[PDB]
Amino acid sequence: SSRHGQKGVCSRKWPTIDMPFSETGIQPDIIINPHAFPSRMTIGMFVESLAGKAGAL
Amino acid sequence: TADFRTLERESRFINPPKDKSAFPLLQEAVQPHIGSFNALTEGPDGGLLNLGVKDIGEKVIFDGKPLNSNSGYLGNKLSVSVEQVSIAKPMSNDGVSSAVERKVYPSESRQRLTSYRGKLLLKLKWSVNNGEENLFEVRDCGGLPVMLQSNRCHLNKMSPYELVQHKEESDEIGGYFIVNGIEKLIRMLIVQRRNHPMAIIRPSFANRGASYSHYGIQIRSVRPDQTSQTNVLHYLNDGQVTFRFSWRKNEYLVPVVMILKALCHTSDREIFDGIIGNDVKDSFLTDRLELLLRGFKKRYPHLQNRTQVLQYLGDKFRVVFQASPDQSDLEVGQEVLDRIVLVHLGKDGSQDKFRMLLFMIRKLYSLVAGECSPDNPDATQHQEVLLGGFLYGMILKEKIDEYLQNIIAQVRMDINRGMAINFKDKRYMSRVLMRVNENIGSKMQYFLSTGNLVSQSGLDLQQVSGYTVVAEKINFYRFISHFRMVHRGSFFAQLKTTTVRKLLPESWGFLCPVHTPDGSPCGLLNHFAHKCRISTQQSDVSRIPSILYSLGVAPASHTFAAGPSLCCVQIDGKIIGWVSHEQGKIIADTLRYWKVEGKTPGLPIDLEIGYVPPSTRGQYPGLYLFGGHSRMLRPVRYLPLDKEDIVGPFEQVYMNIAVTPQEIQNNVHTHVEFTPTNILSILANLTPFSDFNQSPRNMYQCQMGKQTMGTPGVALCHRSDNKLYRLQTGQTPIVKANLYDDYGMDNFPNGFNAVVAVISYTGYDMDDAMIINKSADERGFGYGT
Amino acid sequence: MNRQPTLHKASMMGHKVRVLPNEKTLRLHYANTGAYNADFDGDEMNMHF
Amino acid sequence: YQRLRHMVNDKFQVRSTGPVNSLTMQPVKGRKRHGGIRVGEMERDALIGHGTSFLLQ
Amino acid sequence: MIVPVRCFSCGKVVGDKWESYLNLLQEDELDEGTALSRLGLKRYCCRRMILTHVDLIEKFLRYNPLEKR
Amino acid sequence: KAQGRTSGKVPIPGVKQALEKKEGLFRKHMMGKRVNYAARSVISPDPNI
Amino acid sequence: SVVGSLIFCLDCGDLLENPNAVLGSNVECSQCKAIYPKSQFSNLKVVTTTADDAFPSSLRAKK
Amino acid sequence: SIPDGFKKCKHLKNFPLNKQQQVWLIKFPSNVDISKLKSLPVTTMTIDKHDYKINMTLLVPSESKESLKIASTAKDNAPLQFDKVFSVSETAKIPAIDYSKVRVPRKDVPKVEGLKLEHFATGYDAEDF
Amino acid sequence: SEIEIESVQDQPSVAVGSFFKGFRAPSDTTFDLYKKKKSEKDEFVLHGENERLEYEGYTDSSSQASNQYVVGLFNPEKKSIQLYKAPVLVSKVVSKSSKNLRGPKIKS
Amino acid sequence: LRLTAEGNKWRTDILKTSVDTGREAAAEVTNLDKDTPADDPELLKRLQEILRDNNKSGILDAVTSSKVNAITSQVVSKCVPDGTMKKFPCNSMQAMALSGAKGSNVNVSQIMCLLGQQALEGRRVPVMVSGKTLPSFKPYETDAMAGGYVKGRFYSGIKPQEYYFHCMAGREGLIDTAVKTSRSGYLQRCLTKQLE
Amino acid sequence: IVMTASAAIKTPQMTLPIWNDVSDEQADTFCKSISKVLLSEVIDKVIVTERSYVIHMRFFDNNEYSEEYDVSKEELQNVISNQFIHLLEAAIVKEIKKQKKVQRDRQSAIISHHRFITKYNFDDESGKWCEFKLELAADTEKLLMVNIVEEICRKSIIRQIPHIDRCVHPEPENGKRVLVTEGVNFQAMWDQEAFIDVDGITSNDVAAVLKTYGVEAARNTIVNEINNVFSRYAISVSFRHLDLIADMMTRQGTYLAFNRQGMETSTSSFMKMSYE
RNA sequence: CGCGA
Numbered sequence A: 001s002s003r004h005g006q007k008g009v010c011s012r013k014w015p016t017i018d019m020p021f022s023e024t025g026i027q028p029d030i031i032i033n034p035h036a037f038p039s040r041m042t043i044g045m046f047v048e049s050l051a052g053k054a055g056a057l
Numbered sequence B: 001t002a003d004f005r006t007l008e009r010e011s012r013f014i015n016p017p018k019d020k021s022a023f024p025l026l027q028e029a030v031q032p033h034i035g036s037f038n039a040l041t042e043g044p045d046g047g048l049l050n051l052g053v054k055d056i057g058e059k060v061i062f063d064g065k066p067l068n069s070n071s072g073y074l075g076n077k078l079s080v081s082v083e084q085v086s087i088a089k090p091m092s093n094d095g096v097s098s099a100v101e102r103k104v105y106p107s108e109s110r111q112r113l114t115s116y117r118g119k120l121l122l123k124l125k126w127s128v129n130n131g132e133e134n135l136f137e138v139r140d141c142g143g144l145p146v147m148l149q150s151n152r153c154h155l156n157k158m159s160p161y162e163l164v165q166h167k168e169e170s171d172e173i174g175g176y177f178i179v180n181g182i183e184k185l186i187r188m189l190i191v192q193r194r195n196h197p198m199a200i201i202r203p204s205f206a207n208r209g210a211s212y213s214h215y216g217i218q219i220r221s222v223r224p225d226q227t228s229q230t231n232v233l234h235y236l237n238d239g240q241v242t243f244r245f246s247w248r249k250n251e252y253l254v255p256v257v258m259i260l261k262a263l264c265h266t267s268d269r270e271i272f273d274g275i276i277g278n279d280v281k282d283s284f285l286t287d288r289l290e291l292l293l294r295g296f297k298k299r300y301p302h303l304q305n306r307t308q309v310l311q312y313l314g315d316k317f318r319v320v321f322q323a324s325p326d327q328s329d330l331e332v333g334q335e336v337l338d339r340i341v342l343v344h345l346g347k348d349g350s351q352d353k354f355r356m357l358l359f360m361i362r363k364l365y366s367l368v369a370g371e372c373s374p375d376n377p378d379a380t381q382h383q384e385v386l387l388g389g390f391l392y393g394m395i396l397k398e399k400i401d402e403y404l405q406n407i408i409a410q411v412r413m414d415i416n417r418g419m420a421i422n423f424k425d426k427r428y429m430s431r432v433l434m435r436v437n438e439n440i441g442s443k444m445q446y447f448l449s450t451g452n453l454v455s456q457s458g459l460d461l462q463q464v465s466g467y468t469v470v471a472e473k474i475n476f477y478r479f480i481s482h483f484r485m486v487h488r489g490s491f492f493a494q495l496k497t498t499t500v501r502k503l504l505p506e507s508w509g510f511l512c513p514v515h516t517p518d519g520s521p522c523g524l525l526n527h528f529a530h531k532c533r534i535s536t537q538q539s540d541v542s543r544i545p546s547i548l549y550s551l552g553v554a555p556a557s558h559t560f561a562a563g564p565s566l567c568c569v570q571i572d573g574k575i576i577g578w579v580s581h582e583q584g585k586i587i588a589d590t591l592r593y594w595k596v597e598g599k600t601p602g603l604p605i606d607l608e609i610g611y612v613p614p615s616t617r618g619q620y621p622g623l624y625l626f627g628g629h630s631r632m633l634r635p636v637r638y639l640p641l642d643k644e645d646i647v648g649p650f651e652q653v654y655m656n657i658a659v660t661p662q663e664i665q666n667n668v669h670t671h672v673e674f675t676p677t678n679i680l681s682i683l684a685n686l687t688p689f690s691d692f693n694q695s696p697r698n699m700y701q702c703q704m705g706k707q708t709m710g711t712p713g714v715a716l717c718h719r720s721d722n723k724l725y726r727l728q729t730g731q732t733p734i735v736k737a738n739l740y741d742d743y744g745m746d747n748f749p750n751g752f753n754a755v756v757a758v759i760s761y762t763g764y765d766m767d768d769a770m771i772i773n774k775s776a777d778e779r780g781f782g783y784g785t
Numbered sequence C: 001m002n003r004q005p006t007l008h009k010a011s012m013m014g015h016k017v018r019v020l021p022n023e024k025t026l027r028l029h030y031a032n033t034g035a036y037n038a039d040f041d042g043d044e045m046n047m048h049f
Numbered sequence D: 001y002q003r004l005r006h007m008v009n010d011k012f013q014v015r016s017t018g019p020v021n022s023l024t025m026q027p028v029k030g031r032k033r034h035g036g037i038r039v040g041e042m043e044r045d046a047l048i049g050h051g052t053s054f055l056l057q
Numbered sequence E: 001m002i003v004p005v006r007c008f009s010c011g012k013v014v015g016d017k018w019e020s021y022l023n024l025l026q027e028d029e030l031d032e033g034t035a036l037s038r039l040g041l042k043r044y045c046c047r048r049m050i051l052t053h054v055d056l057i058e059k060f061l062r063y064n065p066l067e068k069r
Numbered sequence F: 001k002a003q004g005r006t007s008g009k010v011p012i013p014g015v016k017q018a019l020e021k022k023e024g025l026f027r028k029h030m031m032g033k034r035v036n037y038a039a040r041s042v043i044s045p046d047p048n049i
Numbered sequence G: 001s002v003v004g005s006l007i008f009c010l011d012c013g014d015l016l017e018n019p020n021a022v023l024g025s026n027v028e029c030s031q032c033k034a035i036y037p038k039s040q041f042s043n044l045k046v047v048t049t050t051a052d053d054a055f056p057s058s059l060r061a062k063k
Numbered sequence H: 001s002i003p004d005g006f007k008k009c010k011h012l013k014n015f016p017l018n019k020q021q022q023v024w025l026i027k028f029p030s031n032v033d034i035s036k037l038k039s040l041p042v043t044t045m046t047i048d049k050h051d052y053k054i055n056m057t058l059l060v061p062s063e064s065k066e067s068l069k070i071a072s073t074a075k076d077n078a079p080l081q082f083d084k085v086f087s088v089s090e091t092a093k094i095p096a097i098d099y100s101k102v103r104v105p106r107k108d109v110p111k112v113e114g115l116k117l118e119h120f121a122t123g124y125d126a127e128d129f
Numbered sequence I: 001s002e003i004e005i006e007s008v009q010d011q012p013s014v015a016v017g018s019f020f021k022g023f024r025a026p027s028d029t030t031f032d033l034y035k036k037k038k039s040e041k042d043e044f045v046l047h048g049e050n051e052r053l054e055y056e057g058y059t060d061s062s063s064q065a066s067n068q069y070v071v072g073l074f075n076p077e078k079k080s081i082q083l084y085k086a087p088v089l090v091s092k093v094v095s096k097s098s099k100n101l102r103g104p105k106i107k108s
Numbered sequence J: 001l002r003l004t005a006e007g008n009k010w011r012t013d014i015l016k017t018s019v020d021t022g023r024e025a026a027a028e029v030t031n032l033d034k035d036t037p038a039d040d041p042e043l044l045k046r047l048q049e050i051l052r053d054n055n056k057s058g059i060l061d062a063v064t065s066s067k068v069n070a071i072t073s074q075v076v077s078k079c080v081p082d083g084t085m086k087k088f089p090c091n092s093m094q095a096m097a098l099s100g101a102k103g104s105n106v107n108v109s110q111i112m113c114l115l116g117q118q119a120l121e122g123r124r125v126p127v128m129v130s131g132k133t134l135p136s137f138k139p140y141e142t143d144a145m146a147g148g149y150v151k152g153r154f155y156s157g158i159k160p161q162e163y164y165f166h167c168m169a170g171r172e173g174l175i176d177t178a179v180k181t182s183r184s185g186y187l188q189r190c191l192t193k194q195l196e
Numbered sequence K: 001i002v003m004t005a006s007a008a009i010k011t012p013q014m015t016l017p018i019w020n021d022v023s024d025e026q027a028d029t030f031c032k033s034i035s036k037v038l039l040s041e042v043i044d045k046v047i048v049t050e051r052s053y054v055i056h057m058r059f060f061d062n063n064e065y066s067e068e069y070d071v072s073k074e075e076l077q078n079v080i081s082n083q084f085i086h087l088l089e090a091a092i093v094k095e096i097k098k099q100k101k102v103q104r105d106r107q108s109a110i111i112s113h114h115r116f117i118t119k120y121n122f123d124d125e126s127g128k129w130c131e132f133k134l135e136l137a138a139d140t141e142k143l144l145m146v147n148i149v150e151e152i153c154r155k156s157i158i159r160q161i162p163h164i165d166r167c168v169h170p171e172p173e174n175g176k177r178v179l180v181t182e183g184v185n186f187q188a189m190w191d192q193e194a195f196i197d198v199d200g201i202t203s204n205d206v207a208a209v210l211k212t213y214g215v216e217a218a219r220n221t222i223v224n225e226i227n228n229v230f231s232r233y234a235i236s237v238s239f240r241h242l243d244l245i246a247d248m249m250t251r252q253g254t255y256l257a258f259n260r261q262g263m264e265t266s267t268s269s270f271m272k273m274s275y276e
Numbered sequence L: 001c002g003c004g005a
């Protein structure tokens, strides 16, 4: 889970080469479906997604 | 914007503080438990127990020797009463020989999987023939479990650097019980506001009999010893008013007029005048009232004296209270009142209890007259938290009480055996006690283990059990989650109605709205807004009346008047006097001002000021001041000055409190919340941007956070706890709330920061959805144990 | 396959078996979810053979 | 992110021969002693309604 | 518990830089930003490893069963 | 139909109570049962099957 | 003393019974034994109005 | 009877009772010194530089002045009863709220100053830009 | 307006007491005022007496702490009043023959 | 998730019309003049009165709930899709609700427009006996904002009062989800057993 | 409908199709006339003054209610005249022992009918008030009158059609023009067909219909009623199911619950035996 | 009556 209440089962450990890789070369650690939102109405996670990156930079 | 304080961080881990914890809030969180438990032995008055035992008093039995004077001589009078109670800190004697003992640190109790218990000691006065001969002998009722980090816990006062030396979590907050190595704690409950009349409407009342209405005035009176006694006034449809009380798990009913004459010598005219006051222009009350007086007369024409009344009462209940054969029904009658009616006013409140009892009847008819609205018991307005320590004392007082009963029983059987008996004999005394079974600690330890309350009276507690709950160390959050936890009790869990689990607006800033479990416990388990504090001790009211009487309060002693027509002034359920509403509002405000100002001595800020403005069919008006224990006090900011003020829930309802300074309106708000974050749980505050999430979704987080695989603690090597989870590598969340550092969750990283793409790619993460980079994992990511 | 509670017969269906290596979890295609009413949030299902 | 409890290794079981409760000569809860899986009426009802009746029975 | 050896995402080896990182914040009194950049952490992948890190082993080390107080 | 023993301690379940209440038997061990060749586990989405 | 169908001795504060219940023309306190005549007064009026809480209406449903 | 500490009043002082004179029962805070006072309104006032704001039977001494007689001015012995009641009690004054100080226009989230480019395309440094 | 203060009697002269409305005693009924000097507090207990009745009353302790009552004799022709400190007596009434009425310990 | 610059402008503007909306319904329910100011004593007297009655209080919410919901529509209608910064198909959020993939126009609205009135028992926020819906509101408040109408949107965020309101509705849902589980399940067994 | 299959329900309703002749106003009038009329409805106030006492009744204006509830002050007089007092005096003595010129003739008549009425009067012109006096023993309790009276006034019925409370001309939905009936009495409506269409009368109460129109109509009512539920929630259930259930509950020709009770008649014991 | 849809 995130801190935003998104709970999910790990679906598959995903071979890293198959995990889409950034312009930078950073494959994501976790890949959460973009469809699992509007229903759960959790914006703070998008926001955190920004700030988290924003901080780390 | 907060920071990592990484240097400041590590310097702490490296060198823990040799003076005091760096996370004071974290302590102040658990304060309700320790504040309660320490208060058992503390306070200028000698501690709750020493006050509690003082209530039990003597246990009298008679040998029955004739003396050879038909003769009214009952033999020697044995007087059995305890004197003062002490609790030794946990100590280890080495086998026998009374070799010089060593202190016991809980780390040992954990690893040995035993209870962590201090010894329990009783100074017992064995008296014969009314102090003609008396015997002081100290006893040991067995090792008593002790709350960690309390005044009887050796760990107390240790600087964090020392706890590490004694192998406890550097920040260890204690506040709980080690029982058989299991960590238990008494989860706080919610009980009716003490020392405060409650105009109740319940259908269950009408069910109790034919002429019972559903109306009632319930009050929950609690002695300074924290024993709670309920007294309820049912309004009967015929116009009778039956005082109801409870004793030995049994309900009993009394005509209220009987009791008024029982309390104080008084004239019927005075009672009537004592209620109606200036309201004689009303027919309704008089009509209701005369049927109550003419009711008591000609129901009981053989009672022309308060004494006769007292005698009559004793006549009935002497059986009930097991009164000693010497005690006259006059004498017993006096006890019945003293041990039941409005206990919080003490044995000397006889003249006060009379007034208070009139006040209810006044209010009751008003409720029946519908002039005042009923009072929601579910409403946090009328509620108070019942601390663990106080409960743990209550039970203990019961066991002590029953213990004396056990002694007298041993003697009577020893008497009815006809065996030769000398009360003055010291060896005989020992002969009795050695035969007597005294281990209280085990019984208490039994309690904490089972959480099953076993008592002669239910302690005015609806449910019988569920009082203890295991401390769960899964993550750190779930652990601390317990100490901010509270609920109404399991009896309300089974109720079909869900109104009890409603998010009443009265919980603002007290019960965190966000943090509750889901499913069946939802709406029951609640958590205090992290700034919510509980009053663990009394506050001095000594000079309050002096202040009040100075402020224009007409003494309740004289100046008969009553009714919602004009304000009433009370302290912890004691009528000080009466004022016009307009005056009271000026008073309560002024008083509120001085309270914060602080320059006026004898007026502590924690005192609630309960001013109830008069209204149309609203709550019964008045001015209420609750300084006692177990109040929900929370901080606010006071606008006329700028200073911290403290606010109870009861008084919150009427106070206009702006959330943020920008919302302050002219002549509207007298107060403002410091930060709006003050209304949230620990975890609630921790959820980032929780205002952006959907509320039911945040509400999971609080429940998810408590289920995480976290860092339970650093003591793992020395902790023997059964089943334990630990996340191998935690990370400080970049996105953070300032409280995260204040509460110092740094010491317990609950998770990691993950590079996350919100995308539909693999297709394997459709429903639940969770794709983990494989290589990322194998790098140790999220590795648990 | 069965997902409790079983509201209606479609909540219990037969399935051809494909044996998948490497993992400890039953695993479904999505078309079944609407029937079983299964969200893949800690969901469990009873397999009968 | 927060790794939770409720790891799958804690939750699953299969094919309980062993327990065979003495009264009913039937299996027992899985847990960690080798139980089985309860069926129950709502599951029974489906079989009847589901269609897999011979099988179900 | 202790410094992760590799950046999860990047795979880059982050395990060594920690000591030097503390050194930077300590001695040089840099910000958090530059030190990382000075350590040569470009990808915010490998930056969060050190940046967010906690040495919680330090607290563990305080409990040593193998020695007197 | 049994007299109260010490008004508490609970009555020991009689034969009638074994059959009836809330199960007591028929709907415990008859109308439903624990079975063999059955496995409960966690579902995982696999689109590829 | 005597207010709203209630009758009190001025010595004792007793509430006093039906004036007519006494055969003799004097009313004596039960506690103080203070004696009053039977009727110093005719039975007093005691107006009692029904409240407005009760009933539905057309007009109270309006006004 | 006479309980402990009680010395019965031996000689009671004089109470010169009798448009006639008026009789006023008036409350005061005990802290107020009534022995030194002068005027009084007929409402609010000030006493000792502090400011202040504004059923029962009366007993008169015996002629012996060791005991108490009821107050009756009717000569009917019908009880003389209190003419006027003025409750002189402690008012206090309250500071007014200063809205200009306390009502504070919101301060926006402080922008973090000195944020350069951390990100650069593959194969380039900070200096190149 | 303004009211001149002629006199303040700081020694007992008169006293105020409370029974009920309409409470009346015979003319010969007198009252025995008892006085303790207790700390600074002056606690007055009043024993009233008549033939068949007993009037017993006493000042409240808690009230007289911060409360002070002064009755006064006001000349309306003048602006002056004669101020006299007086106590406030919480009081009750007992008839002697009704007083000692009592029952036995146990009814058998 | 973002509206365009103009969209927010539309959003704000329509919201500004919602101010007096609360006072209006009261004037209507009280049968007082529509222009009765918020503080009128007879207004409050009736508001004080209508509070004490549960039934009449149920009426006031229904009326007000109507009017404010009309406001909500005017927003969502005028704003989405029109004022949205990224447009369908390029806008994913719309593309999901629209295609019925996941979510609904409601969800997208609450994110990009406002949450709107919080229905509790079909009524608005309960009211403390003081006549305050919440410690931060004047007693017997005529504002819709104080009555649970939420002008905030999850994208921009919600004021604390709104939040505490919105937490209520949340609890109502969760409680209701639990009880729906048990109730119906008992019913079905009655049918099956006899119709087996 | 299903488990309890209770005869008495929370909301008994009678759907009353009206023709298109009767006007909306006409409909309203009929609904008011055939509704519920209580004495406590029209009473503005009541005063009790005390051994005897007098009872005043302030009503609304004779026009108002006789317009509003369509009440002849005479029947109103009569409503008060006989039943009302008989009700009144009843609980009175009941409680007592529990504790151990046009007017003139009418008045004389009324007084004769009862023990406790020694005087009577009424407003025979403006109808505004009713006033009368009751006497009791010189030794009698103070027992609360107003509560007795307020209790009777509410129980007191002026005009009611048995089991039918107050109707509410709903809106003529879906082109269908209907009066909604609270409570169920069909025979009552059967005299009313001058306006409504009796052949279109439908109910919300099965067992009532079964009693009146018999099993088939009752059955048809069931499918209709159940459907309304799932209709309201927009859900969709093929009538074939509802047919099966309805046809089942009617299998005995009575209206049988799915609970223990209806299950009694079943032949197979084990089903019953394993149910509850 | 705690944990999971």
Ligand SMILES: [Mg+2]
Pocket (backbone or CB within 6 Å): C038, C039, C040, C041, C043, L005
């Ligand atoms: Mg699910």
